Amino acid sequence: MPGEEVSQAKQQLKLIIDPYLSVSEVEKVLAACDFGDLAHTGITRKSGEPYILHPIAVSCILANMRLDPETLMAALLHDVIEDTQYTKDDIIERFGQTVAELVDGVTKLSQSSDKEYNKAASFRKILQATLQDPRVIIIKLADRYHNMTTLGALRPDKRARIAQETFDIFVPMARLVGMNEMADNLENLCYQNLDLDMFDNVQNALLQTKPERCKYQSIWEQNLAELLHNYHIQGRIKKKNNNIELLRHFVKNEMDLQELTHSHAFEIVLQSIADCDRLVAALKENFQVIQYQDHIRRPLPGGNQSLMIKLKGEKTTLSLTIQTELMRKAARFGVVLGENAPQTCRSAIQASMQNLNTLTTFNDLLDYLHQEKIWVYTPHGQLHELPQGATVVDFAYSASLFLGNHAVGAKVDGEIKPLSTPLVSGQVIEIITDVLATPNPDWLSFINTQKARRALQHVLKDQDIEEQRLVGAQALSRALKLFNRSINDLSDADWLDLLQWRHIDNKDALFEQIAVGDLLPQLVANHLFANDKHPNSDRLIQGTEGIDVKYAHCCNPILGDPIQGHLTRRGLIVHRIRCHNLLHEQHLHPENIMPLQWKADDVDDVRFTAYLAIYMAMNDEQVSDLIYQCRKNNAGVEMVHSNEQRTFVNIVVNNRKHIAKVIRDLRMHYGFPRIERLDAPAPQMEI
Ligand SMILES: Nc1nc2c(ncn2[C@@H]2O[C@H](COP(=O)(O)OP(=O)(O)O)[C@@H](OP(=O)(O)OP(=O)(O)O)[C@H]2O)c(=O)[nH]1
Numbered sequence: 001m002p003g004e005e006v007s008q009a010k011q012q013l014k015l016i017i018d019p020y021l022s023v024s025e026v027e028k029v030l031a032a033c034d035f036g037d038l039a040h041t042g043i044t045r046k047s048g049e050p051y052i053l054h055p056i057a058v059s060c061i062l063a064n065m066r067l068d069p070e071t072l073m074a075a076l077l078h079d080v081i082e083d084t085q086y087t088k089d090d091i092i093e094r095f096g097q098t099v100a101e102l103v104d105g106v107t108k109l110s111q112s113s114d115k116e117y118n119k120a121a122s123f124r125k126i127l128q129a130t131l132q133d134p135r136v137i138i139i140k141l142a143d144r145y146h147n148m149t150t151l152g153a154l155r156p157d158k159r160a161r162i163a164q165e166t167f168d169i170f171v172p173m174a175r176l177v178g179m180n181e182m183a184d185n186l187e188n189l190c191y192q193n194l195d196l197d198m199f200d201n202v203q204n205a206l207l208q209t210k211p212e213r214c215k216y217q218s219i220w221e222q223n224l225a226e227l228l229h230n231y232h233i234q235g236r237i238k239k240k241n242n243n244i245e246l247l248r249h250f251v252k253n254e255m256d257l258q259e260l261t262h263s264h265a266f267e268i269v270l271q272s273i274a275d276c277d278r279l280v281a282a283l284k285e286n287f288q289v290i291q292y293q294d295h296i297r298r299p300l301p302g303g304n305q306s307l308m309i310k311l312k313g314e315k316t317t318l319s320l321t322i323q324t325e326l327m328r329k330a331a332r333f334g335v336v337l338g339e340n341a342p343q344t345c346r347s348a349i350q351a352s353m354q355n356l357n358t359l360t361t362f363n364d365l366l367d368y369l370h371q372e373k374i375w376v377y378t379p380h381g382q383l384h385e386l387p388q389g390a391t392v393v394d395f396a397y398s399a400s401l402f403l404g405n406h407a408v409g410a411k412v413d414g415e416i417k418p419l420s421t422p423l424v425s426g427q428v429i430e431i432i433t434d435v436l437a438t439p440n441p442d443w444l445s446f447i448n449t450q451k452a453r454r455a456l457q458h459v460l461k462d463q464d465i466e467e468q469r470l471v472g473a474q475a476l477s478r479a480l481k482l483f484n485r486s487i488n489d490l491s492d493a494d495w496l497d498l499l500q501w502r503h504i505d506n507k508d509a510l511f512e513q514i515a516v517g518d519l520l521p522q523l524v525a526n527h528l529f530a531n532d533k534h535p536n537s538d539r540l541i542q543g544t545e546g547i548d549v550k551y552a553h554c555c556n557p558i559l560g561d562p563i564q565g566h567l568t569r570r571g572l573i574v575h576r577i578r579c580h581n582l583l584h585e586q587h588l589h590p591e592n593i594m595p596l597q598w599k600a601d602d603v604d605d606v607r608f609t610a611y612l613a614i615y616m617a618m619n620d621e622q623v624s625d626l627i628y629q630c631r632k633n634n635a636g637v638e639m640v641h642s643n644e645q646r647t648f649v650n651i652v653v654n655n656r657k658h659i660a661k662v663i664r665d666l667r668m669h670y671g672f673p674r675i676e677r678l679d680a681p682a683p684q685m686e687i
C-alpha cells in the first residue's frame with residue numbers, strides 16, 4: 001500500500017515517456033524516480049501520502065508537455081538537495097552536470113516563509129533564472145501548480161502568502177514563456193485561495209450557466225461565420241475558452257447571469273492585413289465597440305501582432321482577436337511549449353519581458369541578468385542582494401553606513417566569522433559593531449561593492465600621500481593572497497607588465513590608483529594570475545572574477561564585440577572599443593582605461609539587444625514579415641517602427657555572430673537594402 005502508491009504513480013509516468021523518449025532515456029528518468037523515492041523514504045506530505053508522489057506528479061505534468069529527460073529527472077529530484085541528506089555532488093554523480101544545474105536552479109527560486117518576500121527582487125531572480133535556462137522556470141511552474149492543487153492540506157494562514165507569490169510572479173511568468181493554459185490554471189487556484197467565498201459564488205454561476213453558454217457560443221460561431229461570408233472575407237473561426245476572463249471579472253464585480261451566459265471569446269485567422277481591417281470595419285457596422293487595441297501597427301513587445309476588439313450586441317459580448325495566418329505562425333516561435341526547444345526561446349522571452357512592467361524596472365536589467373547575485377539576509381529576514389564574492393563588509397555597508405563604518409565582526413548563521421568572510425546565498429548575517437570603531441582601509445583588498453569602497457575612500461581623502469601608497473600596497477598584497485601569492489612574489493617582469501598595462505611610471509602610482517583611484521586590487525590580481533585556480537564562473541568578461549561590471553548605455557556592447565573597460569567611481573563600465581564616450585575618456589585619462597576580452601566568443605545562456613536601422617520603408621505586410629523572419633532566426637523582436645525613409649528594429653540576439661547572421665538573412669530576403677547597426681536606440685523610437 002505505501003510502496004504500491006509510489007509504483008502506480010511511477011507506472012503512470014512510464015506510460016507518458018515510453019512513446020517519445022528512447023529506451024535508455026526512459027531508464028534514466030525511471031532511475032531518477034527510484035533515487036528520489038530512496039531519498040524521501042518515509043517522509044510524508046501534510047495530507048499523508050509519501051513525499052515522492054509530489055515530484056512524480058510534477059514530472060508527469062512536464063512529461064505531458066513532451067519535455068526532455070533532464071527536465072523530467074530534475075523535477076523528480078528538485079527536493080532531494082534541501083529536504084534530504086543528499087547533496088548536489090550526489091546528483092552530479094548519478095545523473096550528470098545538466099540535471100544538477102537544473103535541480104540547483106529550481107531550488108534557488110524557493111521562498112523561505114521566515115525570510116522577506118520582496119516582489120521586485122523575486123521577479124528579477126526568477127527572470128534571471130529563466131533566461132539562464134528556461135527549463136528551470138517550467139519545472140518551478142509545474143511544481144507550484146501541483147502545490148496549489150493540494151493547498152487544502154496547508155493551514156489557511158500559509159495558503160495566502162503562496163497564492164499571492166504565485167499570482168504576483170508565477171502567473172505573469174507562465175504567460176511570458178507561452179504557458180497560457182498553465183497560467184490560467186494557476187490564476188484560477190490563486191482566486192480559490194485569495195477570496196474563497198467570491199470564488200465559490202462565481203464558479204457555481206459559471207457551472208450552472210455552462211450548457212447555456214455552450215449553446216450561445218455555437219450560435220455566435222455560426223453568426224460570425226455568416227458575417228465573414230456576407231462581407232466576402234476568407235477566414236477561420238476558433239471558439240476560445242473564456243472561464244478565467246469571466247472569473248477575473250465577476251470576482252470584483254456584481255453578478256449578472258445574462259452577461260456571464262452571453263459573453264464569448266473567439267480567434268479569427270484571416271489571410272491578409274487588409275482583410276483584418278475589413279473585418280474590423282464590418283464588425284463596427286453590426287456591433288457597438290466596447291474596446292479596441294491595434295497590435296498590428298503597434299506590435300506587442302516580443303513581436304506579437306493581433307487586433308483585439310470587444311463587441312456588444314444586445315445581451316451578447318464578444319472578445320475577438322483577429323490576426324493573419326503569418327502572425328499566428330510568428331507567435332509560435334518563442335513559446336517554451338511549442339515546436340522549438342525551450343532554450344532557443346531565450347531571445348523571445350527576453351524581448352517580451354517589457355510586457356511585465358510594474359513601476360521601467362524591466363528596462364535596464366542586462367547587468368543583473370548576466371551576473372547572478374547572492375541573496376543574504378538580516379537577522380530580521382531582510383533581504384540583501386549582493387554581488388558574487390561580497391564579504392561581510394559589503395553586507396554591512398549595504399545595510400547602512402553606520403554598520404559598515406563601525407563594523408568589527410559578524411555572526412554568520414550564529415557562528416563568529418571575520419570581516420573578510422565571503423558570503424554565500426541563504427546566510428543570515430549579524431553585523432557586530434562598536435561605536436568607538438573606525439573603518440580599516442585594508443578592507444579595500446577584499447571589498448567588491450561601490451558603497452563600501454567609496455565610504456572607505458572618504459577616510460583616505462584626508463590622509464598623507466605616503467600613507468595612501470602604503471594602504472594601496474596593503475590592499476594589493478591581500479588581494480594576491482587569494483591565489484597563494486604576495487608582493488614579495490612579484491618578479492621585476494611582473495611589475496614591468498603592470499606599469500605598462502596601467503600607463504604609469506612608478507610602483508607608488510599603481511598603489512595610488514588602488515587606494516585613491518578607481519583601480520580595484522582584484523583586477524590587478526586577476527590580470528597577473530589569469531584563469532588559474534581562482535576561488536560560479538558567472539563571468540562573461542575575462543579577469544572580472546569577484547567584481548560586478550556594467551554595460552555602457554551609449555554604445556551597448558554585445559557578446560563578441562571588441563570591448564574596453566573604463567574604471568569609474570560607479571565600478572568598471574564596459575564600452576565598445578570605438579565608442580565616442582570611451583575614446584574621449586581614453587584621450588583625457590588613458591590610465592582609467594582597461595582593455596577587456598570576452599571569456600568565450602559564444603556563451604549560449606546570455607542574450608543582448610542589438611539596434612538596427614534598415615534603410616527602406618516597410619508597409620504593414622513587410623513589417624509583419626520582418627518580425628516573422630527575425631523570430632524564425634531565434635532573435636526576439638523587442639520593438640519595430642517604420643517611417644517613410646527607414647525601419648528600426650530592436651532585436652534580442654545571442655552575440656555579434658548571431659546579429660551578423662540576422663542582418664545577412666534579412667538583406668537577401670529584402671533585396672539587399674542597407675542595414676546599419678546603431679550604438680544605442682534611435683531618437684525616432686524611444687531615446
Ligand atoms: N501544498 C502543499 N504543500 C506541502 C504539503 N506537504 C508539504 N508541503 C510543503 O510545504 C512547503 C511550503 O513552503 P513554506 O511556505 O516555506 O512553508 P514551511 O516554512 O512550513 O516549509 C512546500 O515546499 P516547496 O515545494 O519548496 O514550495 P515552496 O517552499 O517554494 O513554497 C511544500 O513542498 C501539502 O500537502 N500540500
Ligand SMILES: [Cl-]
Pocket residue numbers: none
Ligand atoms: Cl543616416
Ligand SMILES: [Mn+2]
Pocket residue numbers: 054079143
Ligand atoms: Mn516541491
Ligand SMILES: [Zn+2]
Pocket residue numbers: 552553554555556574575576579580581582
Ligand atoms: Zn560607450
